[PDB]
Design an enzyme around this catalytic site. Structure first.
Site, PDB file in Angstrom:
ATOM      1  N   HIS A  40       0.823  -1.252   0.000  1.00 31.23           N
ATOM      2  CA  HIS A  40       0.000   0.000   0.000  1.00 31.23           C
ATOM      3  C   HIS A  40       0.838   1.275   0.000  1.00 31.23           C
ATOM      4  O   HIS A  40       0.283   2.354   0.021  1.00 31.23           O
ATOM      5  CB  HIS A  40      -0.990   0.044   1.217  1.00 31.23           C
ATOM      6  CG  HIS A  40      -0.483   0.453   2.626  1.00 31.23           C
ATOM      7  ND1 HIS A  40      -0.138  -0.381   3.589  1.00 31.23           N
ATOM      8  CD2 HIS A  40      -0.315   1.744   3.171  1.00 31.23           C
ATOM      9  CE1 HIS A  40       0.216   0.290   4.650  1.00 31.23           C
ATOM     10  NE2 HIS A  40       0.112   1.574   4.407  1.00 31.23           N
ATOM     11  N   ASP A  84       0.259  -7.658   2.065  1.00 27.42           N
ATOM     12  CA  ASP A  84       0.736  -6.245   1.969  1.00 27.42           C
ATOM     13  C   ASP A  84       2.263  -6.197   1.942  1.00 27.42           C
ATOM     14  O   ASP A  84       2.895  -5.815   2.903  1.00 27.42           O
ATOM     15  CB  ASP A  84       0.207  -5.450   3.163  1.00 27.42           C
ATOM     16  CG  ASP A  84       0.374  -3.908   2.975  1.00 27.42           C
ATOM     17  OD1 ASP A  84       0.728  -3.477   1.886  1.00 27.42           O
ATOM     18  OD2 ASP A  84       0.121  -3.237   3.965  1.00 27.42           O
ATOM     19  N   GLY A 175       3.007   6.525   8.408  1.00 27.88           N
ATOM     20  CA  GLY A 175       4.373   7.045   8.144  1.00 27.88           C
ATOM     21  C   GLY A 175       5.385   5.977   8.409  1.00 27.88           C
ATOM     22  O   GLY A 175       6.475   6.010   7.871  1.00 27.88           O
ATOM     23  N   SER A 177       4.566   2.763   7.965  1.00 30.36           N
ATOM     24  CA  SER A 177       4.160   1.680   7.000  1.00 30.36           C
ATOM     25  C   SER A 177       5.304   1.293   6.074  1.00 30.36           C
ATOM     26  O   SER A 177       5.981   2.186   5.577  1.00 30.36           O
ATOM     27  CB  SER A 177       3.041   2.126   6.084  1.00 30.36           C
ATOM     28  OG  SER A 177       1.875   2.338   6.890  1.00 30.36           O
ATOM     29  N   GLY A 178       5.439  -0.019   5.878  1.00 30.52           N
ATOM     30  CA  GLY A 178       6.507  -0.564   4.997  1.00 30.52           C
ATOM     31  C   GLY A 178       7.825  -0.799   5.750  1.00 30.52           C
ATOM     32  O   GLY A 178       8.689  -1.491   5.245  1.00 30.52           O
TER      33      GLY A 178
END
Ligand SMILES: NC(=[NH2+])c1ccc2[nH]c(-c3cc([C@@H](CC(=O)[O-])C(=O)[O-])cc(Br)c3[O-])nc2c1
Ligand SMILES: [Ca+2]
Ligand SMILES: [Cl-]
Length: 223
Positions: A40, A84, A175, A177-178
Site C-alpha cells: 500500500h 501487503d 508514516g 508503514s513498509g
C-alpha cells in the site's frame, strides 16, 4: 512511532525512507539492490534514501538511489491488506558499510512473546500529527493469534500478526508503514495497519514475512 525513543544515528542500518519530495513510508534493505516495503506504499517516482537519521538534514552517510522497479505482490488486496508486501529494486547497488547494511530474512516464523524492534519516521501522536526529524524506535512483543483475532475479529489472515501493547500508548503509526519489525536479527514483519495508533486493545498489524521468503527469493532471482 508513538511512545518510542530516539534510536540514535545509524543504529538501524537496514532502515530506508521512501521519498517522493517528502518521506511517505519506510522499508528494509535485504541485499545491496533490493528493499522490502508494503504494497500500500506503492507509487511511481520513488527515491530510496539509505543511511538516514535526520531526514530533513544531509548529515553524511546518506545514499539516495532511484527505484528501477517496484513489484507489488500479485495477490495484494487493497481492501483487506492481505499480502501487503512489495519489493523495490534499486537503479544501482548501494555501498554497504556499518551505517548501511542489509537485514536477514527469517528461516522460521517467530512465536508469541518474541520481542522485536520497530522503527520509522511516522507520526508520534495518537491524537494529532507530529512527524519527527530523526528515527524513532519501539521494542514490542508479538501477541498470540487469539489475542490478535479477538482485537480484530474477521480481519486477520494467516499472513498477518499483531505486535504491541493492549494497554495502548506504544505502537507504530501512519508514516511507519513498509518499515521493519526485526526480532533476533531477522526481519519478521512489515508495518502494515491498525485502528488508529496506540489505542487500547487495538495493537498494530504486520505482514508476516516468514510466509513470503520463497516468493521473495524467486522474485529477486528472476528480476
Ligand atoms: N496503528 C498502527 N500500528 C498503524 C500502522 C501503520 C499505519 N498506517 C496507517 C495509515 C493511516 C492512514 C490514514 C489517512 C490520513 O490520515 O491521512 C487512514 O486512516 O487511512 C493512511 C495510511 Br497510507 C496509513 O498507512 N495507519 C497505521 C496505523
Ligand atoms: Ca539526513
Ligand atoms: Cl476471527
Amino acid at each position: 512511532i508513538v511512545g518510542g525513543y530516539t534510536c540514535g544515528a545509524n543504529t538501524v542500518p537496514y532502515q530506508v525512507s521512501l521519498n517522493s519530495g517528502y518521506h511517505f513510508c519506510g522499508g528494509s534493505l535485504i541485499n545491496s539492490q533490493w528493499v522490502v516495503s508494503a504494497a500500500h506504499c506503492y507509487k511511481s517516482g520513488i527515491q530510496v534514501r539509505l543511511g538516514e537519521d535526520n531526514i530533513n538534514v544531509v548529515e553524511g552517510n546518506e545514499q539516495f538511489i532511484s527505484a528501477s522497479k517496484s513489484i507489488v505482490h500479485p495477490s495484494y488486496n487493497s481492501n483487506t491488506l492481505n499480502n501487503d508486501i512489495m519489493l523495490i529494486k534499486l537503479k544501482s547497488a548501494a555501498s554497504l558499510n556499518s551505517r548501511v547494511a542489509s537485514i536477514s530474512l527469517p528461516t522460521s516464523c517467530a512465536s508469541a512473546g518474541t520481542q522485536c524492534l520497530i522503527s520509522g519516521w511516522g507520526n508520534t501522536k495518537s491524537s494529532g500529527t507530529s512527524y519527527p526529524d530523526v528515527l524513532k524506535c519501539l521494542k514490542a512483543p508479538i501477541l498470540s493469534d487469539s489475542s490478535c483475532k479477538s482485537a480484530y475479529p474477521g480481519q486477520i489472515t494467516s499472513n498477518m500478526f499483531c505486535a504491541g501493547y493492549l494497554e495502548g500508548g506504544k505502537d507504530s503509526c501512519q508514516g511507519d508503514s513498509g518499515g521493519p519489525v526485526v526480532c533476533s536479527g531477522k526481519l519478521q514483519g512489515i508495518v502494515s495497519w491498525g485502528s488508529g495508533c496506540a489505542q487500547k486493545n487495538k495493537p498494530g498489524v504486520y505482514t508476516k514475512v516468514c510466509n513470503y521468503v520463497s516468493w521473495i527469493k524467486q522474485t529477486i532471482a528472476s528480476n
